[PDB]
Amino acid sequence: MTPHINAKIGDFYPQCLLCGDPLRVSYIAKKFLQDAKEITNVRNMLGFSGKYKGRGISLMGHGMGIASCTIYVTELIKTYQVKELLRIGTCGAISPKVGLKDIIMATGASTDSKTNRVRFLNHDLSATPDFELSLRAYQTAKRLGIDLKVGNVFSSDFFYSFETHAFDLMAKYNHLAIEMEAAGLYATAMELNAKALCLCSVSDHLITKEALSPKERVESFDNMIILALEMMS
Amino acid sequence: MTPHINAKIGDFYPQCLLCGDPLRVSYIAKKFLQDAKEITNVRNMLGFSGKYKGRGISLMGHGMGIASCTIYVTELIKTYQVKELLRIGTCGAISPKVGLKDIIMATGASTDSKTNRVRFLNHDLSATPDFELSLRAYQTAKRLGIDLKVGNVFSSDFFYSFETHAFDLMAKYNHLAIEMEAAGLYATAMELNAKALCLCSVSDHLITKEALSPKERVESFDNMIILALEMMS
Amino acid sequence: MTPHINAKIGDFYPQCLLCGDPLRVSYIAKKFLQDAKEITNVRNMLGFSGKYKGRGISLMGHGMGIASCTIYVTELIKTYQVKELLRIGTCGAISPKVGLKDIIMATGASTDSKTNRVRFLNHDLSATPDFELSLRAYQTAKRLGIDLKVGNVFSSDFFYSFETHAFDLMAKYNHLAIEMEAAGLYATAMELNAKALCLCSVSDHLITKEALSPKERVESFDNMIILALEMMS
Amino acid sequence: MTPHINAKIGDFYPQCLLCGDPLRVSYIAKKFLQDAKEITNVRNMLGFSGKYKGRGISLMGHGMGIASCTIYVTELIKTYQVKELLRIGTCGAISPKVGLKDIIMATGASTDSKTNRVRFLNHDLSATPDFELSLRAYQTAKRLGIDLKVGNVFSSDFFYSFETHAFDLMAKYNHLAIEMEAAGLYATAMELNAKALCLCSVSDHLITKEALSPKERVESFDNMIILALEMMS
Amino acid sequence: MTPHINAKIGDFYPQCLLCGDPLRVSYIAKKFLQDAKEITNVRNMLGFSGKYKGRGISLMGHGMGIASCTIYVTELIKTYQVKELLRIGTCGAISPKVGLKDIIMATGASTDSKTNRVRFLNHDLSATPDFELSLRAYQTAKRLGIDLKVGNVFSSDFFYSFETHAFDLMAKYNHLAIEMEAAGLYATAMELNAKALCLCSVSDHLITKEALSPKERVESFDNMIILALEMMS
Amino acid sequence: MTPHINAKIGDFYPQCLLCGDPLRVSYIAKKFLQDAKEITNVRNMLGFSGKYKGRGISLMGHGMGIASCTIYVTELIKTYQVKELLRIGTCGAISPKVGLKDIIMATGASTDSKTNRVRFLNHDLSATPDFELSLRAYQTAKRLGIDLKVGNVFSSDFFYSFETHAFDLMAKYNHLAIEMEAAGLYATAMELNAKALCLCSVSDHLITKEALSPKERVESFDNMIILALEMMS
Q1: Are D and C touching by the rule of 3+ CB pairs within 8 Å?
Q2: Which residues participate directly in catalysis (chains A, B, C, D, E, F)?
Q3: In 3D, which of E189, E181, E84 has the Cα closest to residue E137?
Q4: Which residues, 6+ apart, have CB-to-CB distance to F218 below 8 Å?
Q5: Which residues of chain C are within 8 Å of residue B114 when distances are taken between CB atoms?
Q6: Residue A129: closest C-alpha in chain B
Q7: φ, ψ dihedrals at A165, nearest 5°
Q8: Which segments of E13-148 are extended strands (E)?
Q9: For the domain that residue C32 is a member of, what is the CATH number?
Q10: How would you class E215 by CB atoms within 10 Å of its CB: exposed for 0-12, middle for 13-18, buried for 19 or more?
Q11: Chain centroid offset of residue C114 CA
Q12: Do F88 and F18 contact (CB within 8 A), yes or no?
């Protein structure tokens, strides 16, 4: 149907889970979904539709960078009628409020992209999640004894940043971690009146140079895929 | 003590409700607080300290526009150790999703001001409110039966806009109404590690040209006043 | 009548003195004008009409920052048919060419605001006063024995600057002091074919830190008030 | 070895062909290289190494958008010692100077991204390819008798444009087509002193609205795969 | 001595007249000066020193555009000790307040150049003349029977504008004409603590499309030449 | 005919050499062409027509800076039907890849000017020459035994930079030298669908502070003149 998804009109559940990594897309389908079927794979970017504890969920990969995410989020919304889009991934912590393992809920995604200025009269679009997915996230985490942590992220166009001198100022302004797609997600979902949210797990801490060795990696991660699949039940 | 605030240290409770109009601050103090006491009056910009149901609460006017708001919040936080800033005021609605009498919770404050680009590396700061404050508002609105509309707001440098043709584009991106201070409030609280939220009563709707009577005003502004006093007592 | 002025049409004389502080306006009306009457008091922003040397003068407060100033002078010109606007105020000197108690005539008002790019094609609007008003100021000052310092000011959206390191560069480019409204006053009167001028009294020096005593401030501001009333009569 | 490439230092040859679609990297590998070996598959993005008419060629996919391309090009150059990067892809045409089937060499890559302004002092970086690569591309296509259309492309952050009205002005200034990567490839190559060039095949024509049929995509594509492989040998 | 001026040190008087056109400079020197001496001729950009009513006056051409003017003005001040610079030239009127043969005094010089954002912190530099030179111009015009038309000019990088639809807005904001150097002359004189002014002869009206004959051009410019030489003697 | 060229219709051959310095133009005319005739001299900006190997070639001065170059180039193309414009000039090297006497071929002109943002949607116009001309230049340089340096230049609005600290970043991004017209030439040629190239002779090195003698300057320029005349033959 779409230039980047050849799934079938209705193959998606109205509530989709999102990663940049199509590998962890399937990792969630395998380890977490019953009735798991692969619905899309153009450019090897994969999505799945299954059921989590009797309730049907879709999964979908969005690649890396705001433009990439914008392409897939736009198509999930305008063609496949997706309505709620949760995004989950890792991030680089920059705030002394976050330690590794932590899960961040992004109540706002700042950015160095020009996309929002192109979208929004060259003014300052404050790209924000949808509210009633956010309180769902805080209630389900307290429900779970997860100390969900809430603040802004900075969505950058640069994985290898040319402005590492500025992280302290970003963290000063309640940016807990840096990721690369939430601003495009939040903005696209704003443009199209859909509901979106983004969570991230602190894998690396860019200030304390600390990191998670591959052990607790796909164990810290999993502790928030259920977070997401829970919230979404 | 500061060039813009007249009060001794300790005169301000760590919780403070904010309005642009200092005569609404004065109206709130007399009609809703016990033992109210005018603690500042520089440039006729009034502030009060009193109690609402046993709980100590402060009130402060902040003038019109981001620059004015910013001066007053900076001095509240850094001299008078105010920790929670809740702003209530009116707004011109631009979104079909709301109408007169509605109370908006601003989960993002977009802007045409340059101040956040000055603050934040010439990038896009998503100015946002403190999440736990945004939670107590949702909880208190529900307890009180208020249908709280939740979305973004646009803080303009212009009361008389030169971009009225753009109100639709803003409404499309889930900007419910226009005011002039939220983005500066949210950015100053982010800079100084304090908690802030902005609530807005729809007094006029700039697209539907509907206004309301100069007495349903004080009554629906009253609603918001009780909602705010309640969520911090 | 307007949302921010509740004076009747015709209550304002065609020449108007402005200050940021309404208690300053009130001070001028009681001490220096004859037969002054309060004509507006919305949001505690007082305005007055009275007589000086047989001639009708109006006073009006405009609050703090470009956005607030812009509201009041837009309304004064467009609704109350004010033709000439003289703003007096204090300022923080940044240049070695001025000292305490100097009066600066602002023949250019630079800014970190975005309002003039929004107004003016996103180009650089050189915000300037009316030349005939500035000529009348220089002639009245000469008659009074006042050595007027003439140069640019910098109108900032920030009272508490994040760019203090730049004050020397501003001084280099003939910015004698910093204040927060001139560029908006000048742009609005340009927009609306009205005549405006800004005079600033040097009460503090931001570089050398010298300040005026409380008595010296009153005396200094009085010398500027006499200058202003004399050049409007 | 890197966060996004799984190969080891040694597995990439100095000369690498680039595509956005990793399935297209495999098509080329299976049909054109002997000894084809898959060397990386992080996030399911596939790189290959093999031989073409005796000489060793490498292949790597880079995803969609300037940000995603930059992550991979940076890693290929800095970690895997790639030195020539030839990019081949599709493009939507916007100019009357090109029809379908045609191959465009991008002697420059304009863009609506802010990445080059972040990289290059908020000025205008003219992102261009290495001249030696483009000289071979023209000589090789001349030997194969392929009519090479040479001019600028426009690299955008947007697959689904918000500025369709602008395509005519882009084509007037000698932009033959729009894609989403060339500017980031050229600017990363410039940054890290590597040689880069972008060729792209006209699969769509956004103005005349006519596209290539299913069989016709891979047809004209091949003719350009050979041009690329021929010029690396 | 400088790369663009080969006059001996001391060849320039401290007061210098400027035109874009070196042949206009040549014309002034032959027709109006006593003992005119050509002192520099690099790139055919002529300059002269001579006498007017027994007082030394220098002349210098500066070519077309902010960048050309900035070069010559920078060298005249820093190397040749020029202290006052008076620019006289033609312009394309855009305001209904001026007609053919008017002389405009530019109390401000707006621009579509980025030069002042580069000079001045990416903020808005309000480029203005020296007030005393303005005053001396006004008093000399009055003495000679010349009614100066006083307001802003817009200094553009473009002779052949791509924004002719904006002229009405420029005129609305008190821009009386368009030329191509004043903003550079003023910013450079401000940078270097020198005294500068720009005077413009209305030879063409861009709105009405009326234009002076070749004779009427000579006669009109001569009257402005006498204004200039008189205000310097 | 135009306000800046007084050549009669058809005086210009469709191939034209361009220099900033009109006396450099006059020099080429007497030393390097046969039957040379001066065809324009407005504002002392000389232009010539003549023959090299019996083929007609025209020569035109274009002053200093983008705004000035843009004027003469627009009129050459639009009014005099010039189809091929070749700019030869000097520049100041900033890269260790080049030294004195080297001839640079600008395949890209970055800039700090705002002209291209004004022309091109406020985006990044990557300003480039006509490939065919650049190829012809490379073939002729090899045919002449000339070691052509190839890369970008940076076209500044400033001869006296305020950003000398940033010359290594530019050199890092393969800007070999700094001049002041190339991006204006390239953009105007793109605008009006004509063919242009820029060649520089390195006369000063802004890093190492090397510079050429008065003599070494004309001997190396004569090399560049021969290259230019040969590739038009």
Answers
A1: no
A2: 204
A3: E84
A4: none
A5: 112-114, 157
A6: B107
A7: -65, -20
A8: 15-19, 34-40, 47-52, 55-61, 84-93, 103-111
A9: 3.40.50.1580
A10: exposed
A11: 20
A12: yes
> Burial letters for F182-211: b for 16+ Cβ neighbours within 10 Å, e otherwise?
bbbbbbbbbbeebbbbbbbbbbbbbeeeee
Across chain C, where does the E strand assignment appear?
15-19, 34-40, 47-52, 55-61, 84-93, 103-111, 149-155, 175-179, 195-205
User: Does residue B102 have an active-site annotation?
Assistant: no
Q: How far apart are CA A85 and CA A15, in angstroms?
A: 6
C-alpha distances in Å from residue A149, one per residue of A206, B193, E30 = 18, 15, 80
Cβ atoms of D179 and D91 closer than 8 Å: yes
Beta carbons within 8 Å of B205's beta carbon, 6+ residues apart: B92, B93, B94, B98, B99, B100, B211
Q: In terms of C-beta distances under 8 Å and separation of at least 24 residues, what long-range contacts does D141-146 make, across chains too?
A: D141/D103, D141/D227, D143/D230, D144/D226, D144/D227, D144/D230, D146/D103, D146/D223, D146/D224, D146/D227
Look at strands C47-52 and C34-40 and give their pairing: antiparallel
Beta carbons of D73 and D29 less than 8 angstroms apart: no
Q: Does F9 touch chain D (CB under 8 A)?
A: no
Helical H runs in A79-130? Answer: 115-119
Q: List the alpha helices (DSSP H) in B46-146.
A: 66-79, 115-119, 131-144
Nearest to D68 among A3, A22, A68 (CB): A68
The total domain count for chain B is: 1
Residue F7 is classified by DSSP as P
Contact A15, A58 (CB under 8 A): yes
Among D194, D201, D202, smallest CA distance to D225 is for D201
Q: Tell the burial category of D100 from Cβ atoms under 10 Å away from its Cβ (0-12, 13-18, 19+).
A: middle
Out of B65, B74, B118, the one facing C112 most closely (by C-beta) is B118
Q: Are B113 and B158 in contact (CB under 8 A)?
A: no
* CB interface of C with E, residues 124-153, below 8 Å: 124-128, 131-132, 134-135, 138, 150-152
DSSP state string for E189-222? HHHTT-EEEEEEEEEEETTT--B--HHHHHHHHH
Element holding F222 (H helix, E strand)? helix F214-231
Q: Residue A182 has which token pair?
A: 């939430």
The resolution in Å comes to 2.2
What are A203's two structure tokens? 């894998």
Catalytically annotated residue among B21, B112, B157, B204: B204
Residue A34's DSSP bridge partners are A51
- Nearest-neighbour CA in chain B from A133: distance (Å): 12
- Asked if residue B81 lies in contact with residue B87, where contact means CB atoms within 8 angstroms, the answer is no
Pairing of strands B47-52, B55-61: antiparallel
Please say whether the beta carbons of E59 and E71 come within 8 A: no
Closest by CA to A169, choosing from A181, A152, A183, A184, is A152
Catalytic residues of F: 204
Q: D72, D60 in Cβ contact below 8 A?
A: yes
Residue B87 lies in domain? 1-233
Q: How far apart are CA D233 and CA A8, in angstroms?
A: 43
Asked if C162 has any chain B CB less than 8 Å from its own CB, the reply is yes
Token representation of residue F158: 């400033």
- C108 reaches E (C-beta below 8 A): yes
d(CA A107, CA A90): 16
Cβ atoms E123, E142 nearer than 8 A? no
Choosing among B66, B123, B126, which should be mutated to test the A contact, i.e. which has the most A CBs within 10 A?
Answer: B126
How many of the other CB atoms lie within 10 Å of CB of F166? 17
How many other C-beta atoms are found inside a 10 Å radius of the C-beta of residue F39?
22
Residue type, position F232, single letter: M
